Amino acid sequence: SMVEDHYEMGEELGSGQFAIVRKCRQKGTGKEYAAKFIKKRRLSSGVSREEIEREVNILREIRHPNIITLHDIFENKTDVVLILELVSGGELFDFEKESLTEDEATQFLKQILDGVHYLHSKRIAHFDLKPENIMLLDVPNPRIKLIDFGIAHKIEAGNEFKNIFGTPEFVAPEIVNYEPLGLEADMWSIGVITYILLSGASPFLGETKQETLTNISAVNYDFDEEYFSNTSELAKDFIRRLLVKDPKRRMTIAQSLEHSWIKAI
Amino acid sequence: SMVEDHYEMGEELGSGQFAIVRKCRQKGTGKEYAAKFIKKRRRGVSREEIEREVNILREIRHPNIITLHDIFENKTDVVLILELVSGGELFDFLAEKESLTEDEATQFLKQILDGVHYLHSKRIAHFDLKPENIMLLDKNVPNPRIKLIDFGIAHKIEAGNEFKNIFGTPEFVAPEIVNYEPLGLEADMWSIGVITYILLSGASPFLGETKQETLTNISAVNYDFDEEYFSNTSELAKDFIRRLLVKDPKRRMTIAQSLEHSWIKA
Amino acid sequence: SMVEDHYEMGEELGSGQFAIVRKCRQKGTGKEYAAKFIKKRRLSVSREEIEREVNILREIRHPNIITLHDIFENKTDVVLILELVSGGELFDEKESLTEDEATQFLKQILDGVHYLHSKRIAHFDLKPENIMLLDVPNPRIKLIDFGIAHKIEAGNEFKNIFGTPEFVAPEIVNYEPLGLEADMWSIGVITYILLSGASPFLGETKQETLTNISAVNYDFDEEYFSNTSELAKDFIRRLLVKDPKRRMTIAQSLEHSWIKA
Amino acid sequence: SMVEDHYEMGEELGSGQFAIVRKCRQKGTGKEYAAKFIKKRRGVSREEIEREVNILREIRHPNIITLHDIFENKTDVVLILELVSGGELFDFLAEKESLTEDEATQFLKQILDGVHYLHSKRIAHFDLKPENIMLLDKNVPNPRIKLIDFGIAHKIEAGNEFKNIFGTPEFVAPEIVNYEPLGLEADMWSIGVITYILLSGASPFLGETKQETLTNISAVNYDFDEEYFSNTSELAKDFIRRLLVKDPKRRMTIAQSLEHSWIKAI
Ligand SMILES: C[C@@H](Sc1nc2c(cnn2-c2cccc(Cl)c2)c(=O)[nH]1)C(N)=O
Ligand SMILES: C[C@@H](Sc1nc2c(cnn2-c2cccc(Cl)c2)c(=O)[nH]1)C(N)=O
């Protein structure tokens, strides 16, 4: 392609399994972007054509202020390059505060919930919600962007979807147990994110991957007074309603926006 | 890469001899572009002519000139993904305006001049400047932006290389095209003179009753400023045109001189 | 100098008598600036006049006044890298303005001039062309062009013939002692134009204009001012006053009821 | 132009053999700079001044000092340079409570980015040592490193052998000590020495006399004494070991160093 005729590539910002993300600069304007290079499967030796289309069709369909914007798209013989909106404020948890107040946390959280509400209203599950994928653009309460739709999927009801994916610490028990997946998995992950926001501790993280997965599958967590002594009963109830094994009993996205902790500004 | 994986095709915008141009939509973003399909000679356009057009588009980056966004090539065709101009032809927009002052006219003309100045500073002649190839990007804004299109016969002019050709639309070509004499950057300036004449009057300066008359009028530089068309036209605007409609290309006003002329400076 | 090592020069924006101003772009960052080239007198503008302008720019730091960013000199020219104003001139078009929208711009001009006058600096060239915007219902104004600005010491007479005729006080026209009061007259002229879109003293020739200024011949023609409060007219009336000692000063003007409301 | 028309001189910051560097203030703006006065030949040769200046002109990077202006009269060259107000890196580190390998590698990565830019232009600094690694402002959350003093920097041309004896003994590669051909690899050795000092606070080759130091450098006689290095990862030691290598052709290059796991670990 002509991607290098339009964008000057710069410093590497991230590597995933078959993706590399670099800072780049639009040559005409000086505006900065993120360029995500995704290796294509050519088995005359990558990611299949079908998985790239899934990511791209999902990005095409979503237009929301708390969700990353896809600006441009190129393909050469080895790679598909997505020109994405650049987030210059870095990752959430990096803004660094040990833990947060309930006001500061709820302001971030409400933005994530609005984002996920938009996604879920389109039947799109992100499946990879975690602190690393919550980016800020800058202020007392800055503006959040959800990124990385690399494993996002449209959920069709009556059509079973199973997979093993995500980062262990943040995945729902239905991922761990290889059980049917849906929009409810994102809500579990929101529960985990909320726990970390208020405490600076991960709720299920054990001494090994094996312990972590056990704790997630049995829903073994607590509100240790070392981490949660500055925590309201309301905030704990909000988390308690999300860290629920049965996905049919777990609080949904609309319910979560109407919960008293979020409603109390 | 297959063009149909990336772009959805739409309404046809234009057809040339082995090129067709359609509006298209980038599948990842929803953004609109123009797709120019060019049939390759394997009976087609020569590989050499396609490369010339493409290398010229690659090299040019200017707000008054169409932007080449991407390229696709299979065995039979070259597809150029170009910037979409949604505003239509300049002169068509001007025919929707109640009146047109010399100030408002010179503001459009200055955009064309900036574009050509950029080209000429890279030794690129367009060779096909005429109303059809002066577009607006969006005609609904307070001050629309002009875009030059169609680099189908554009050429880099190399010193110590004579370049001769017969091309362009007769009405708009310099006498050196008509007479099969050496060509350069000066041909574009003649064409700017013709465009300027039409802008202010709505009449074509050399157009005769037949192609044969038109070519005679161009070769002899037979035109006038009939009071029926030019009675509201300043002496300055006429001088600007008179300095461009000059037979000897070495005496014709150049692009830098034209930007410094009092009519444009005002 | 190394000015061209730091800044890429672009389109010409303005020419004055021995100044040219171009758009430029800082090479490291992509940030845009205005570059003002000022031709140096070599008998093979005087050094003293360039220093005056520069020392004035150095001393002034105010949000409604242009910021000097950098400064270079080569053999023919002194180049000032100035803050770029991308909103254009004030008067661009609305034909005339409402009193609310006018007073919002005007208050910014007054704050700027208040800062200047508190440092004993007269601008001497206040006019619409030198009021620039940066963008909104009421955007931010910047005063530019300190090319004839001067420090006024009281008991030191300063006389000159300068400025644009239409906007100069009668003490300029009559070659009488000048001070901070000349800016206030010019503020009166600007205010008149803001509300009406007409110039108060402009005649059919320069000769008429200068006569009208010197005699203070102006009116509030109903064609231009039927959309005008008594308060706004009083504000202007207190500025278009021949005797500079009777003319409303900058502090008084900020306290006048039209501005306070 | 006379320097005293534009800049007011202040506090002296450093003296070399025919250079003095002072803080100064730009008269038009109030902005602070460093002024480097260089006496011209009983002086520095015209050739050496041009070398330094051309190198500074060519380099634009956030971790490298910026040359702002130049003045020249018959006796002197004055370089107006960016002012670094934060002091020497190592001096800031001696104010810090502790220093983790994470916080250390964040400083080191800035030096590496700077040297990567230099080496990509075929410029060797040849004088990398703690005194020349400055912070621009030590009061911000993450201070920015600036490399200074291009007084012996050189463009390296292939097919041209370059030999010299220069630098501060403690920090020079064995090819300087042995009067062998020099290149970009000499900077990498010096980065190894700086890294050793960063993590331990000890100099790896420093002996009881200059004579011992030079012996130690030439034989590559150093260790990772457990008294200084017991809290140091195997990775950090490997990174240093790959730089303190006698044969310049075997020594880790700047690109390799940015890709090494210790640095890549963020
Ligand atoms: C492998 C990539 S996937 C990915 N990264 C993004 C996106 C947007 N910004 N960034 C990103 C990654 C690392 C650093 C920064 Cl600043 C930004 C996106 O849509 N997908 C990752 N998560 O690091
Ligand atoms: C033979 C083609 S060549 C061509 N057409 C262009 C270009 C850009 N826009 N358009 C175009 C043509 C017709 C209508 C419109 Cl809206 C746009 C270009 O670079 N070459 C033509 N002019 O019809």
Ligand SMILES: C[C@@H](Sc1nc2c(cnn2-c2cccc(Cl)c2)c(=O)[nH]1)C(N)=O
């Ligand atoms: C000869 C210049 S003097 C001048 N011009 C300025 C300044 C700041 N911006 N501009 C300027 C001039 C023309 C256009 C634009 Cl956008 C800006 C300044 O301090 N003195 C003039 N009045 O046009």
Ligand SMILES: C[C@@H](Sc1nc2c(cnn2-c2cccc(Cl)c2)c(=O)[nH]1)C(N)=O
């Ligand atoms: C003789 C000078 S050579 C030099 N010194 C610089 C430069 C930039 N900053 N400083 C400097 C020197 C000492 C203290 C401080 Cl704050 C700054 C440069 O390019 N050459 C020296 N190393 O002391």
